[PDB]
C-alpha cells in the first residue's frame, strides 16, 4: 500500500515532525544503499549468492532518527564493528564512511523519523570453506524506512501482556551468540508462533539455564525494590537497554546486568521492554499473571518519558541529518 | 568450470560443451517466475528470508543428466516448510517441473540445484494475519560442487572435533529442518583454520556427535553402521548410505554416538549432496584404525556412484 510516515501519538512526549514528502523524489519516504548505489525500496535487492543469505553470514545494527536527529549513532556503529570483528568480518568501509553514507541515505528519504539498518555480510565473492581471507569480499547494505513501533501508542501507555515461551529457548552463546546481532531468528520466530497459539502479544525466551533471555526485537528489564536489572547473558547489548540503565541510575536506582529467574520475573514490582524499534514500554502481566496491580508502574513511566526527552534535548547523543 | 577429469574410475562427467549464445548456459536462477542469469539472481532485502532467515531449503543434484532422489528432496523440503508453518505457494509437482526446466536451461549435465522457500517480503515477523504472508520460492542451478577434492575422496580427510562451539539444539533452531542459520557451522569452520584441519564435526549439548557444515558423519564399528540421529539433518545422502550399508548386509541405524566411539571406530566417513561420500581417516590427528580408507567406506563410496548412473526410480531424466 501507500507510505505512512507520521502519526498523532496519544502521548505528549512523542511528537513526529510536521512536514511533507516530495512525490517527485523517487527515494522520498524509503530507500536503500547497495554496492555504491542509492536505490528505491522496490530495487533494494541482493545476490542470492551472498553468504549473508545462504549462510546468514552477516551481522547488522539498527539505529533510528527522530525529529531529524540520529540517536546514538556512534554507539551503534561501534557495536556494529565490534560484532563484525567477533565473527572475523573486516568491514569494507571505515566507521566514518558508514556514518556518512547512512546519514546521506536518511537525507535522501527526506524522513525526519526513521529506522536505519546497516548490515555487513561475508559477500558473494567466496563460499563458506574459502581459507584465503583475501578472496572474501564483504558487503555493506543499508536501508532507511519509516520509524516502526513494536507496540502501538496505547500499549506504551497502558502496557503489554507478556508470555514466557515454553516450546523454545534462546540460542546459546556456544552456538549462535545473541550478543552479536544477527538475522538467525529461528528460535525467535518459534516464540512468536507460540504467542499465536497461546493468545499473547509478545514472547520472552529463557536460556539453557532457564534464566531470562530476551524477546524478538527487544530486551526485558525487571525492577524490584528500587533495583533495576536486565539479562546480562543471552541478550543483545541493546543501545535502548543501555540508555534505560543510564536513566535508572539517574533516578537513583542501582541498575545492572544480571541473571534473572522466572520467579523473580513474576515477583517484580515493574517489568518493561525496550528496543530501537519502539522505544520503551511496560509489561503489565506475564502469562496472564499481573505484575503488581497490573498497570504500568511509576518508575517505568519516568523511564519512558525520560527516554523520549533524550531523543529531542540537544546533547552528544544526537547527530543532525543534513536534509 | 563445469567438468573435470576426476582420476577416479567411478566418477565421470558428461562429455559436452555449453552453448555460449545461451545466457543461462552453465548457471541460472528462478526468481519470481523468471529464469535469470546468475548476475541478476537477486532477492529483496525486505524478504524475511534474508533479515530473519525465515526460510528452509533443499539441495538436490544432477549427474549424467539425471536428478538424484528428486522426490525425496522435494518431500523433505515440504515437510521442513510445514515444520516452520510455511505454506508453499507451489505444489511439489510444480517445484519439480520448474526445477527440472531450470536445469535444462543451464545445459548442465552435472549440477546442484537449490530450492528455497521463504516467508516473503509482503509481511513482517509479527504479522498475526497469515493470509497476509506471501512466501517466495527461489531456485538456483550451478555446476556440481565438491566439498572435498577428488584425491581426498580417494585418500581420505582429516577431521576435527569442534571445541569452541556446539551445534544448535533442536529447542532453539532445529538442525532437522534444513536452514541457512549457520552461525555455529561457520564458527566451526573458523576453528579448523585456527587448529589447521580440513573439516570440523560438531557435538550437541550432551557431547554426542552432531554433524558438520554441509555433511552428516557415519561411524562403522564391528560391522555395524551408525549415524547421529538427533542434532543432524536427515540427509538424503545419509539415507542412501544406510540403504547401501543394508544391501551389503550390515546393520544400519541412527544412534547416539559418543566421542570415544568416534576415536575408537573401525571406519568413519562423511556424506553430502555436495560431494557424495568420502573417508575420514583421522580425528584431531588420531588415526582411525590404520589411517587409510577402510574397505566398507570404499564399497559404500563406489556403490553410491553406481546408484547415480544405473537406471532406477532413483533417477529422473532432465529433458535438455
Ligand atoms: C533480538 C534483539 N534484542 C534486542 C534488541 C534491541 O537492541 P537496541 O536497543 O540496540 O535496538 C533488538 C533490536 O532489533 C533485537 O533484534
Ligand atoms: C548441515 C547439513 N547437514 C547435512 C547435509 C547433507 O544433506 P544431504 O545429504 O541431504 O545433502 C547438508 C547439505 O547441505 C547440510 O547443510
Author numbering:
A (entry chain B): 8 to 330
B (entry chain A): 11 to 330
Paper text:
ATAs transfer an amino group of a chiral amine compound to a ketone compound using the cofactor pyridoxal 5’-phosphate (PLP) with a high turnover rate, stable catalytic activity, broad substrate specificity and excellent stereoselectivity, which is achieved by a proposed large-binding pocket (L pocket) and small-binding pocket (S pocket) in the substrate-binding site8910111213141516. Each protomer (subunit) of the dimeric enzymes shows a structural architecture typical of the fold-type IV class of PLP-dependent enzymes, which are made up of two domains. The substrate-binding site is surrounded by the cavity among the two domains, the cofactor PLP, and the loop consisting of the residues 129–145 of the other protomer. The substrate-binding site can be divided into two parts as described initially, the L pocket and the S pocket, which is consistent with the previously proposed mechanism for the substrate specificity of ATAs in which the smaller and larger atomic groups of substrates are recognized by the S and L pockets, respectively.
An improved R-ATA, designated as ATA-117-Rd11 was derived from ATA-117, a homolog of Ab-R-ATA, by the substrate walking approach for use in the synthesis of sitagliptin, on an industrial scale, whereas both Ab-R-ATA and ATA-117 could not produce such a large compounds. The molecular engineering of ATA-117-Rd11 involved 27 mutations that made this ATA conquer the severe reaction problems in the realistic industrial production, such as a high concentration of organic solvent, a high temperature for enhancing the solubility of prositagliptin ketone, and a high concentration of amine donor isopropylamine for prompting the product accumulation. In the final biocatalyst ATA-117-Rd11, Val69, Phe122, and Ala284 (in the S pocket of Ab-R-ATA) were mutated to Thr, Met, and Gly, respectively. Comparison of the active site pockets of the Ab-R-ATA and ATA-117-Rd11 shows that the volume of S pocket is enlarged by the three mutations. Similarly, His62 (in the L pocket of Ab-R-ATA) was mutated to Thr to increase the volume of the active site around it by reducing the volume of the amino acid side chain. The loops 129–145 of the G136F mutant and ATA-117-Rd11 showed significantly different conformation from that of the wild-type, depending on the amino acid residue at the position 136. Gly136 was located near Val152 in the wild-type, whereas Phe136 was distant from Val152 in the G136F mutant and ATA-117-Rd11, accompanied by the long-range alteration of the loop’s backbone conformation. The residue 136 was moved into the L pocket by the alteration of the loop, leading to a probable hydrophobic interaction between Phe136 and the cyclic group of pro-sitagliptin ketone. Simultaneously, Arg138 was moved away from the substrate-binding site by the alteration of the loop, resulting in an enlargement of the cavity to accommodate large substrates.
